[PDB]
Amino acid sequence: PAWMRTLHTTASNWLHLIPQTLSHLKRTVENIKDPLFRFFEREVKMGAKLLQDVRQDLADVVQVCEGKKKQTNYLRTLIN
Amino acid sequence: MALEEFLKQIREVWNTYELDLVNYQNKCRLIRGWDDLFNKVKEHINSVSAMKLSPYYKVFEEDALSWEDKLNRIMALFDVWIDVQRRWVYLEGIFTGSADIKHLLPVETQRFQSISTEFLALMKKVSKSPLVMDVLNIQGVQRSLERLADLLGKIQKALGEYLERERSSFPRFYFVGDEDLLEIIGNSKNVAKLQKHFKKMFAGVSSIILNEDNSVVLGISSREGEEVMFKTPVSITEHPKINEWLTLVEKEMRVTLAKLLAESVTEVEIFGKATSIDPNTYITWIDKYQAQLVVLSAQIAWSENVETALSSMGGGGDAAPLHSVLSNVEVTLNVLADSVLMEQPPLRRRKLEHLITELVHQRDVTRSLIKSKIDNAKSFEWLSQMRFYFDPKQTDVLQQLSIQMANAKFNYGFEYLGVQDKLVQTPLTDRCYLTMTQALEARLGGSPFGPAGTGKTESVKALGHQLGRFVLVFNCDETFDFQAMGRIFVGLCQVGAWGCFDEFNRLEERMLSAVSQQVQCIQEALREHSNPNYDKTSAPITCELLNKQVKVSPDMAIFITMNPGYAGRSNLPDNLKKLFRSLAMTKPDRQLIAQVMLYSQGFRTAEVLANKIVPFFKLCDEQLSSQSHYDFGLRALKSVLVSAGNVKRERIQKIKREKEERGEAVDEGEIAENLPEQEILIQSVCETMVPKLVAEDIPLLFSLLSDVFPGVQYHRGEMTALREELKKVCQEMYLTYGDGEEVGGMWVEKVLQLYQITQINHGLMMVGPSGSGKSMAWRVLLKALERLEGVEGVAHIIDPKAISKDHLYGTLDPNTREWTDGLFTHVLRKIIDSVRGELQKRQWIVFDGDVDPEWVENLNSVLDDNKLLTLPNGERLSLPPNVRIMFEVQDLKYATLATVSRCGMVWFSEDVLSTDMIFNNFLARLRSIPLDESPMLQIQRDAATIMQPYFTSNGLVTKALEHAFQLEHIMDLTRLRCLGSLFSMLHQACRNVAQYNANHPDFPMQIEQLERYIQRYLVYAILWSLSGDSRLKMRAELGEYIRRITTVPLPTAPNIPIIDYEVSISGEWSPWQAKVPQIEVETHKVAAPDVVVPTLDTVRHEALLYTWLAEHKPLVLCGPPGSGKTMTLFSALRALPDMEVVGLNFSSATTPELLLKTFDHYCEYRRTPNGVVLAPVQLGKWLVLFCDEINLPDMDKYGTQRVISFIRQMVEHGGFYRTSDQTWVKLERIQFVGACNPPTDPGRKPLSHRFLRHVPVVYVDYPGPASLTQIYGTFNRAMLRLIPSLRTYAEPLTAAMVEFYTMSQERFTQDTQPHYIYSPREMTRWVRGIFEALRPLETLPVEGLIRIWAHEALRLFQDRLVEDEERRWTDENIDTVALKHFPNIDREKAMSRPILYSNWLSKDYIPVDQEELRDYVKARLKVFYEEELDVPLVLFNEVLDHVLRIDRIFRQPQGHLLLIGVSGAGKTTLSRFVAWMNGLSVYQIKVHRKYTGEDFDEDLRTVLRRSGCKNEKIAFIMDESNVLDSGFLERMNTLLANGEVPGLFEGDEYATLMTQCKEGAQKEGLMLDSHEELYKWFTSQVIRNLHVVFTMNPSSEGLKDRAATSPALFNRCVLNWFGDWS
Amino acid sequence: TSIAIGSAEGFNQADKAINTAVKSGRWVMLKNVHLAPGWLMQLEKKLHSLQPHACFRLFLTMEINPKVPVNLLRAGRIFVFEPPPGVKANMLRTFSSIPVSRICKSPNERARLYFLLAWFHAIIQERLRYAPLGWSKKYEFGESDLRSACDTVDTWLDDTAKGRQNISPDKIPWSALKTLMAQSIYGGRVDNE
């Protein structure tokens, strides 16, 4: 379909822009005492989690746009 | 032998026990001493059970059993008598003390005299013989008491008009419910029962003080014991009327406070204008006067001193006596601080803290005045402050004190407030005071707005308490309508009280506009009250409220509180907002609050502590992980500061005790100096904030504690006494206990954290994932506290979302304005009344369920410091100190900040409940609890030993479980669902061994045999419990991984997966294929609904369901529609004869009512000593509730399905509550089976994890092509036995049928159209259609067989198509499939495009020519016009096809039609024509503008009666326009699927229907007498005599909506897409 | 006769008031009628088949909500009430709303204070148009704030000036007006530092 092909290009192009890796900060006995590390560990943890979700969602979207996987209730809402 | 003596002791007690009778006004001898009577019965009942435990119970069993019957009767009789006697007491005082009621209400005054005369008769009989057993032996005494109770309720309910009039006499009665008001009026003579009601009518008066005659009121008392002695005592003898002397008491209360204030002002003038103050003199003054008076007098003295000083500086160049005012405040504050440092009586301590709070504010104000160089008393920097002026020369004592702020002047109301917790006067508080007082001067309301926990509600009360006003807090919701809010205004206006309405935007917008008229009308009365022209000697100011003239007191005020940032809240109309003055309170001055609170509590380093504790809360908010259950606001800071004072007091008491027991040297100064205030604050912080923290945040907070508070460590106390109690309780409850790092130490720590939170907060939340040990924690704690403190613990568990909000809190009748209690309201009110000693017990109300703002925001004032349950009828219920409100939840993603802030939080994690402890609990129960109710227990013990090596840390089960979470399941996988599935199956294995031993009494199973069976069974159980909700590939995956890890012998097949093997009782593996044979079905049973062709998947699922169903464990069948879920359960239920199954068809609109309607039909409610028990009417039968669309019910905006919560409550707790009497009902012999499609399907929602924990799920996928060949090749082989010439074509015919079904299923999917569902149901209909045509046919050439095969396929796969392209595909693909599997046949003869079949031109169903069919229909249509409907119709080819399709379904049992097409296409007319042709009677409902659901039920009853009792074939034609509500489709859905509506016939309608069914069955010649067989015959008749034709337009979104609203419309109805004319 | 829409009893009052007024010629005002779109369709039908008194008037106050029936909008004459377009329009509306006899009281300085009141009010609302820069959010600075401001000026001017014809500007309670306006009248709605 027209929108099915249109969403495929956008999802694939979007996957190119977004990065792929983001490693969590490492806990250390003296790192905890640093407030800067205390704040930054939350930043990467939120970033790495959200990065994994969005990319996986787009991945599923491209899979639907190629017909490899069936549409689900959440996937229908996300694609809509 | 000691059993006999205990029986003799109990016999002697009851033969000597007599009812303690005391005279009541020389009218009767009322029963006294209920508590001793009830306790003795309870003690003997528990003893009666103990003797049964011993094996010697048998010799005295009959006598013991006869005894327990008598005590139960005693308990039953006296559980009503106490209610009857109490009801009669206050009803007697109303019909006798008052004279106006006899003229006003004469009819039931005589009714009361009749029942009363019966009561005195009964009482005199009890008097003659006061023996308890003799009273029990009175004939019909139980029935008589219940009749007395029922009648007294009717008279009591019929006193509403009298109560409304009495409220006008004494205005404060408007804040007392009807139940308590009757008690107050009736018990006017005996004042001792009035003491518990004064708290509801006064701000700080909890009890009154009387002389020893109880005839003169000497004064009042508060809940803290503070007393005010009246200067003029009120004598009740002179004013016998209750409303008369209550007014005098209220009037005297104000006067005596004003006169005491004048005395205190004169006394405090000495402390003012004094350079040095003696602490002993100041302390004596403080103790002499009440708490609110000492603060007021200090306020007056400071105000006059500043006014005097500013007058001296009025010349400008004069000196500065303002410094003398500052020094006097500082000198007084130093004495105040010194007094707090030393120990003080609790009442004097609270007075000192209030005085400290006031003088800190005075010092700050005076310093500001000096810093501003103020020299004039008329400067606004002094006038903007709140100043207190006293005029002793004024004759009116109530007018001697004036409160002024800016231009606003107020008179002290002199309402006694007791000892209220004062607020720190922050700059935001001053801005609030300035703005609210300006609103009061403008005769306008106040609207402090902002986020939660900013001090808005307390600010209104604090200002009202400062003016001596009675402030009433109302927690408003959507039920606060025009009438309820208007009645609240009437009470406030007449009393002269402040009404603070918090969450006032929770009202409906239409209601908000409506109340603006009343607020505006009230303010105009207030505005005209303030004009000097008005004189109080004239007519008092009245306003128009609820069509009544209501007096308005000048002390009345209205304040509203809202959070305008909450999404989903009503927007106030502008004409309402202009009636109020709004102020933003967003950033409370926490630092000043913390500093003043710690300074008043006795901390020397308060300033350092405050500067450390306020940033720490900010640090925790921004450095800890963001969790929805985290709150670090002012309310959290308020709790820790209060607990810090409590801890410091406890520590000081501890050090003094240590000094006392170690020598004799005690000094307050030494202890205060050498006291670790840093550790006290840290301990308070951790005790409140640690339990809510997640595991990752615990080091995070303890690290932050090191930077802000270096050097101080938290060492939690070792609660040795409580831990021992916990260990004993856990041992008896089969729960694992550990200390610290042992298995279960984290869970024990969570329980201890829960205990600590109970002591600080009255509101608690256990938050954690499903199966985290939350419920087991508080159950064990409740028992342990019972065994330790000796206080009996009672737990009331409520599922708030399993019922409606009306049923949870109560409903106000819009017509009669009568209040009925809800579930939570009834429990709370019963505890408050404490008729059966509920206040001496620990009452816990656990809200186990989902939390959303709609229902829990009603508890805001309950969980605040107000501790009030406000109801829309003006009633306020106080939370007793022994009651805890608990919320056991799995998430808080929908709760708001208001709810989270008000509750203490304990966070539970899946880590807290280690898999090891679950294994230990299962094994401990197996070794202890026999499975019969022991040889079985012995088998269980040997079995438990065998599985012990596998139920270990990182054991086979653990490793398998870990690997299982990495696979994909049709439902979300949780640990406890899988393990509960595993444990139930292992119970079956033990029951299996018992069966073998019973079947082999000579040779029972050996240990080696048991070991082999258990080992193989365990692997078999692990696979099906951990991969039953997965497809075939992951079942293979789990089997492969288990083969990699296990040491148990496994089948040695090179490629067959382990899931294809069962475990024989022989202890050896046996393939499932040995139980699935190639059976040959009879000719007359071909593709019958109850005929199942065994396959590999069928036998595996059947044996699985038998294992789960037997254990009575609820289960869920998941899979695509038509996969065989319903077929498998009924086939598995066959092996369960004692189990009776009832089918319920869930829809989007399904509520727990459908569950309740089924219960009212198939079950009965039986009252027992234990309680109300709901059990099936059939005896020795287990009712199986089969719900077909469990995941279909609608989810609200907060992710909850009400019926799913209802079922979850019914399974987890074993019962539910009856909204009729808030009575707990316990289920018996009732099991539950669920069926559903995968949650990813449209319209389906994922089931809650808490529900799924109790229900194992097995995935039933579509049979494979190999399975389809076997299931339908057998049917064809039997079907084709009718004509032997076609028997050789059985194999190719099945192949063609299998192939076309696969292509149709692959080509058309739900993506294209919502109704494009293809399943083996179509393949079953395919075989039925061919068989039905072939039955009469004596012989048929192969060409005719293909024509029938092609025809049925066109009817099953093409009739539902929407686009012509799809239909063309079906036609062509059918041509190709038939030629692919049937070569060398006459293509044209067997596949002529007009494939038409009919039984109209002959007796048999044979192919019909188009032109002959057209002529015959023309002739029939001619008769149709002259007989039924004279509407000429033009006949075209599509019409001929349609009338043949309609004729096909009308000839089928339970055949229903869904005709989809454009309006006016002929659907209704054609259906009427075919129905007339087949003899069916057309029924259509006549919808008008007033047609409601009750009309539809009556219309339905007409169809059911005619088609079920009269054996009349009826075609029920219904159009989508006939549907006016979702109620229409809910009954239609049930009727289409089951053929009967559960709640359609009730009362006399059911009685009449059974009579007609008996008459109808007699006509048929059948002998049915009982009701259940009459209904079953009635159901069978309707299923065979009713044809429902649904007609709707081809809407795109409407079709998708209907696929969930009415699932039966797409599963039980044949869909025919007429569409538009081509 | 003014009735607030939203309750079952209110509809009964509205119907009774309209029936009485169309014969007697009184004025009926129904407020927040946008909260009952269904009843509005019934009311428009009742109005169409009616021959009221010559002096009868029916005023329906409502927000600009799409739920208002179209037929009612076509049946009636629509007047839009919104912030005045500019400072001059804002000040002209204020001077029209305040009665002349109130401004022209004994102190000759009252007229100037009312003008600074109109100018302050006009500047404040016109800044609301520029949502991020003029203020931080759409504060509801409206007629209620202006009326409360006018009452406050009247109260404190009469307090300081005891019926005198002229008061020197130094004795005007500037601090009282400024503080009450920044903390209570206009500052009450302000929740931003």
Ligand SMILES: Nc1ncnc2c1ncn2[C@@H]1O[C@H](COP(=O)(O)OP(=O)(O)OP(=O)(O)O)[C@@H](O)[C@H]1O
């Ligand atoms: N300390 C323990 N030792 C052993 N078994 C335990 C312990 N605590 C709980 N269990 C068992 O583990 C399971 C946990 O159920 P429980 O009701 O305690 O969990 P929950 O967190 O309240 O669940 P939900 O959120 O689903 O209501 C139960 O079978 C219970 O008997």
Ligand SMILES: Nc1ncnc2c1ncn2[C@@H]1O[C@H](COP(=O)(O)OP(=O)(O)O)[C@@H](O)[C@H]1O
């Ligand atoms: N000025 C203050 N001094 C002392 N405590 C305060 C002050 N302001 C607020 N609090 C405390 O904050 C808590 C929450 O305030 P609350 O009345 O719930 O505000 P809201 O109306 O915004 O919910 C109260 O328990 C109160 O004791």
Ligand SMILES: Nc1ncnc2c1ncn2[C@@H]1O[C@H](COP(=O)(O)OP(=O)(O)O)[C@@H](O)[C@H]1O
């Ligand atoms: N082994 C089998 N033997 C006989 N019929 C089967 C078998 N497997 C599937 N079927 C057919 O599949 C259909 C399943 O329909 P149903 O029980 O309503 O499934 P669900 O409950 O999943 O919707 C039945 O009509 C049945 O004839």
Ligand SMILES: Nc1ncnc2c1ncn2[C@@H]1O[C@H](COP(=O)(O)OP(=O)(O)O)[C@@H](O)[C@H]1O
């Ligand atoms: N085959 C037909 N020939 C002539 N008139 C028809 C035909 N089908 C429907 N009609 C017209 O439709 C009217 C009846 O409406 P109906 O077709 O029953 O509505 P619906 O198709 O929505 O059920 C009749 O007045 C009749 O004139």
Ligand SMILES: [Mg+2]
């Ligand atoms: Mg509040």
Ligand SMILES: [Mg+2]
């Ligand atoms: Mg639980």
